Design a protein around this nucleic acid. Sequence first.
RNA 1: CUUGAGUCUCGUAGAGGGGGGUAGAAUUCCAGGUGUAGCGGUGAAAUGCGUAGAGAUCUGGAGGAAUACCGGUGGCGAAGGCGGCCCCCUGGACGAAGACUGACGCUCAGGUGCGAAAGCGUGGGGAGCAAACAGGAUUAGAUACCCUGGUAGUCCACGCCGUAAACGAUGUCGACUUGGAGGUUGUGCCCUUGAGGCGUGGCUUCCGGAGCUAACGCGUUAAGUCGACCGCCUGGGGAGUAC
Lengths: 117, 99, 88, 65, 106
Amino acid sequence: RKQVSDGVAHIHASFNNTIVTITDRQGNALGWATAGGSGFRGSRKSTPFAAQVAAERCADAVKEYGIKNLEVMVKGPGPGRESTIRALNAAGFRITNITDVTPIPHNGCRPPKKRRV
Amino acid sequence: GRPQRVAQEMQKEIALILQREIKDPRLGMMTTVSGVEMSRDLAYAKVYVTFLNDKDEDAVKAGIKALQEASGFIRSLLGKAMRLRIVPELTFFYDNSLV
Amino acid sequence: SLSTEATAKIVSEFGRDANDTGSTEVQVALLTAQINHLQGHFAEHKKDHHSRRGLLRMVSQRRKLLDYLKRKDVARYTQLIERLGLRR
Amino acid sequence: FCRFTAEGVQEIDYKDIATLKNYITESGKIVPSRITGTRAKYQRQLARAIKRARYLSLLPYTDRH
Amino acid sequence: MRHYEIVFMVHPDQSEQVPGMIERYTAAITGAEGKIHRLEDWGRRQLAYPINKLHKAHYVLMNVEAPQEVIDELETTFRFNDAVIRSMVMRTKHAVTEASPMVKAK
RNA sequence: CUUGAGUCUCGUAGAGGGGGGUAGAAUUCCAGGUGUAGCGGUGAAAUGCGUAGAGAUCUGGAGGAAUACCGGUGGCGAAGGCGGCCCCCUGGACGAAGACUGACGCUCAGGUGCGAAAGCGUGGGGAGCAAACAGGAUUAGAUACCCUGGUAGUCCACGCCGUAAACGAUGUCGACUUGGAGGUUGUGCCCUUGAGGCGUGGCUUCCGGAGCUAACGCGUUAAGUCGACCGCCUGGGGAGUAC
Ligand SMILES: [Mg+2]
Ligand SMILES: [Mg+2]
Ligand SMILES: [Mg+2]
């Protein structure tokens, strides 16, 4: 249908879960990739390799609107997050910038207690 | 205790101190830890950390020593972060995550 | 706490002269004025115990002076106590 | 390393955005005197000054806003 | 009266009353022993961070030795009124009448 | 009598206190938008939860809660303690300089207060969190830890309560005695002068001499030397208990 040509995706670089989404240039996110959704579960959903492979699910939605540029965000410090970025560069889609936007509060929210052995 | 179980919890703690609490970062990058290898009783922890530094030992070496030089200080940090009597010995390894 | 101008007005009459600043009278008068200013603050701020702590530090102070004065010349004391309208 | 003393300002007017910007990161976090070597009072004056300018919108809390 | 340095902004769009309201505010100053030791306006300047989804707010400054009460109604006014979009009031050790970093650029 | 004590004037720093404002993240919720097949959980699942479209993204709102960086031996304090910005109120500290008062002092039984958290009371308030309790994951004591929930509580206001390893496990004050390196904050001088050179105050830190200590150590911020007052103990258990 409608071309965008300026790629903008959102990822959720959580530890136990790894999920990227495709977004329109003016917000309005359209389509997404879940590595957990691929059937990978537990350690397999969290694997950096699962995050790297989840590129194909993100790519097919990008291909449908044929978007090229790359302005994507990373929220959460997932293990081997740089390797997932390498996989996006390995894909060869033109890269404009990546944003390390792990949200930091002012301590306003009360944290929950940490788990123990 | 059970090492293969405590490993998941420790990796989250190691990442939080690594990203927001640095003032000598030769890496100067979001270096991400692929895995940890704690010994029985957690006496020694092997931290395998990949480097967002172009994956070249030249840039990577700058940080791995930087990872090792500030260990006692960071020891305190993780040492006062999980109520652990065992403060794990800190070791650092560039991972060939990409082959 | 105070205005230097109010302290000067007290020093002119309570003190023998402007330079006379240690005279027990010229001392207790200033403490009594300070207590009155603090009392206005406490009327709406009962919680501010920390400020009450000083409040004590002075009511007792003059209390010592009074005696020190009273054991020195009740004459001035007697007038002072009524000059300052205290211990009525 | 006595650079504010070289400027000569015992009290630092907060409206000085150009000095504030050097003491502010791209994120907007205040760099410490560990590396800037500024004396504490000015360090003290600057941190309070940055917040008030930030409230007035002179300084960004963070570009992401 | 005691020293103050005061800055606020009115919505850029409501700049029709911005020149008059100042002195209309100094009506308090001019009418209640207000010794305005300085006043500055800078005009619309892009906000570093957007406030209430607004940009280029109309910047203005004041320097007065003012009594305790006048400032109060003065700011409650701001608290009351709505053309103004954010306010601020800070005491100063002494009066400041020197070019301010905003104007000193000019 | 004036050095002890204390006042005046000049400042000066400070998360000191009380009040009232206010900001921005964050989190939850809610709104929409686009956009879905999940989602989150584990070691794995379970548990949760999604086509009502969730999960994600923007846009918006609501609410409550707390104030990243700065920021640390760094201060503030009797101590408990104090950490967004503004204003109102208010305690104390300190320097300098001069004057004034003139022993006006210290300690304190009894005394009166002060007072971490949880808890009790009333009424509030309700983010997030989390005892209790609740669903899935069990038998060396599983009675579980783990995940999934979750009330009180957690906040307010006023009340009670009066204990914490409230710990420097070091009472208060004063005096005297080798060092060095810091920090901090005053302030004098002398360099134009930063810097620099002389200082000289306050507070704080680390070594450390002598000395002292069973040892450990302590060490001009003494556990050295002394003084004054107070407080306390007299093998351990029973026991801070019966009453
Ligand atoms: Mg509570
Ligand atoms: Mg006790
Ligand atoms: Mg304590």
